[PDB]
Design a protein around this ligand. Structure first.
Ligand SMILES: CC(C)(C#N)c1cc(Nc2nc(N3CCC[C@H](N)C3)ncc2C(N)=O)cc(C(C)(C)C#N)c1
Length: 274
């Protein structure tokens, strides 16, 4: 299943870095043989020492599975000192850019986005993967047009749950908290927790102290607010799972409103982010 290369440069031309992690880099790559573009995750094998077999066994499982809302793992190359995970290039645009660029945006649009993220994350959880880094930056559109699906663009083999901040044991439920935070930002354009003081911010997240403040939340449905409260729940035992959230009427039913909330959401995205 793993392709072997003496030098990955025999296969790919590397262009700009898309993301930099701890001993992982995602780079735009062109396959020299075809001209096709990919996002290639470059990993030094020395960084995997003691878990190489385990990580490869997991990649071997995921290479065979495509989820509509997750970057496909297209190929794996092994060089003498690196692994290269050849991923689908998700080229349709960034999440916040799209919302700002739209002239018209409703709760139904936000619900549609969250439904896709719930589907993707439910699947990762079934496979034993806790994403741990769900945030707008990891969500990209497949295509530039208005019907494009959203995709989780990257995953590991302010948005962090209170139990993680409390250095307590944590589970897949941390992802459900993060999805609630994303839903919050999608309906008002600003984060639910922020303070210039990190200590105050830490305490607000630990206590799950947030509000649906006026005027930004006045024309948002009770159903949306209930949906968010069930995910942004301090107690991971009480917190909705992805499965429970997918059954809530705001996702599965017809309670998401049809009001154009673009003006306020786009103004707040512009004002609250760089
Ligand atoms: C080259 C371009 C214009 C296209 N086509 C483009 C493609 C992507 N694509 C990906 N970006 C990432 N990362 C960046 C986001 C956070 C994540 N942790 C790592 N990882 C995987 C993919 C993928 N699967 O395509 C990203 C950007 C930029 C950098 C502008 C953004 N955002 C630009």
């Amino acid at each position: 299943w793993k392709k072997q290369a003496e030098d990955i440069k025999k296969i790919f031309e590397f262009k700009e870095t898309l993301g930099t992690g701890a001993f992982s880099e995602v780079v735009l790559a062109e396959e020299k043989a075809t001209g096709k573009l990919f996002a290639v995750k470059c990993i030094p094998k020395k960084a995997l020492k003691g878990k190489e077999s385990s990580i490869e066994n997991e990649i071997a499982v995921l290479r065979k599975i495509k989820h509509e809302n997750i970057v496909a793992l297209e190929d794996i190359y092994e060089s003498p000192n690196h692994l290269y995970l050849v991923m689908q290039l998700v080229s349709g645009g960034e999440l916040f850019d799209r919302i700002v660029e739209k002239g018209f945006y409703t709760e139904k649009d936000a619900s549609t986005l969250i439904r896709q993220v719930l589907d993707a994350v439910y699947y990762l959880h079934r496979m034993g993967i806790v994403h741990r880094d769900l945030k707008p930056e990891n969500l990209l559109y497949y295509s530039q047009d208005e019907e494009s699906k959203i995709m989780i663009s990257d995953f590991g083999l302010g948005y962090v749950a209170p139990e993680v901040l409390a250095q307590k044991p944590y589970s897949k439920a941390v992802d459900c908290w993060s999805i609630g935070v994303i839903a919050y930002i999608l309906l008002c354009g600003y984060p639910p927790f922020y303070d210039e003081n990190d200590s105050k911010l830490f305490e607000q997240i630990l206590k799950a102290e947030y509000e649906f403040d006026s005027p930004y939340w006045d024309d948002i449905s009770d159903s949306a607010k209930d949906f968010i409260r069930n995910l942004m729940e301090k107690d991971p035992n009480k917190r909705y799972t992805c499965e429970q959230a997918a059954r809530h009427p705001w996702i599965a039913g017809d309670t998401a409103l049809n009001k154009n909330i673009h003006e306020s959401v786009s103004a707040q995205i512009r004002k609250n982010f760089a």
